[PDB]
């Protein structure tokens, strides 16, 4: 049960200046209003998981 | 009960007065492990031999003569072509069983390198081996 609850991914901010591709690309990104759909788990950012397509450059050790 | 059903088998009250004698049992937190390290003489440089069972060398006894002769035999058109395939599959199920009663280490018949040529004369003994291994 503990391992299963731990795999439900946490929310990790998209804003990142540590990776040089995001440091350049995010200067041209447009922040759009994320309309609330009635939930408490809207993944409007990236997810704190090593296998996520926007978090693979992060070292989860 | 109170508008709730808890399905259980029939209870046996005779299980209450069950004679259960208490037996001695001690747990030793801190005891013996499986292996322990020894200290003896050690050489500076050594060589480790490897008796590789490659099966592709006809220079030593690892060459599976039966498997190659009966496989090459099943390649040619014959009336026993399907029978030879069944024999080869039964031979592969025999090598799969590396029990103390079927293995080369204890020099068992039709499992060691010594008796590898006997398969050429009596391939019918695979069923005897598979049954003998199940018995022991």
């Amino acid at each position: 049960a503990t391992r299963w609850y731990g795999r439900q991914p946490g929310h990790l901010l998209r804003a990142d200046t540590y990776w040089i591709p995001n440091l350049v690309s995010q200067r041209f990104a447009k922040h759009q209003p994320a309309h609330w759909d009635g939930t408490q788990n809207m993944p409007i950012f990236r997810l704190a998981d090593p296998k996520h397509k926007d978090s693979y450059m992060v070292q989860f050790r | 009960y109170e508008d709730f059903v808890f399905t259980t088998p029939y209870f046996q009250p005779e299980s209450t007065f069950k004679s259960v004698p208490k037996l001695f049992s001690d747990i030793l937190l801190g005891g013996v492990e499986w292996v322990y390290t020894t200290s003896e003489s050690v050489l500076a440089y050594d060589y480790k031999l490897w008796y590789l069972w490659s099966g592709v060398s006809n220079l030593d006894e690892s060459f599976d003569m039966f498997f190659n002769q009966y496989w090459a035999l099943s390649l040619s058109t014959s009336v026993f072509q399907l029978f030879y395939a069944v024999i080869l599959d039964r031979y592969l199920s025999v090598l799969f069983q590396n029990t103390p009663y079927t293995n080369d280490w204890f020099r068992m018949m039709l499992h060691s390198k010594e008796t590898a040529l006997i398969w050429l004369y009596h391939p019918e003994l695979s069923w005897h081996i598979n049954g003998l291994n199940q018995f022991f």
Binding site: - | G30, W34, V35, Y36, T37, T38, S39, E40, S41
Partner: protein, 65 residues
């Protein structure tokens, strides 16, 4: 231990968890008088093995050797 079927996480014998450790003999005369390392050459085959040779002596006399 690994080949015997026990997968090993981490390494070493300095157990982080709930296990006993053995640090190794302190190289001072106090512990070097009480303890000594296990000499592998002292672990021997039981000498009762030599009693199987009685079978050979009796067989040689039966065969008239």
């Amino acid at each position: 231990t690994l080949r015997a079927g026990k997968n090993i996480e981490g390494s070493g014998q300095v157990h982080f968890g709930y296990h006993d450790q053995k640090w190794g003999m302190p190289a001072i005369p106090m512990f070097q008088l009480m303890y000594y390392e296990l000499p592998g050459n002292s672990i021997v085959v039981n000498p009762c093995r030599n009693q199987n040779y009685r079978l050979y002596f009796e067989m040689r006399k039966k065969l008239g050797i």
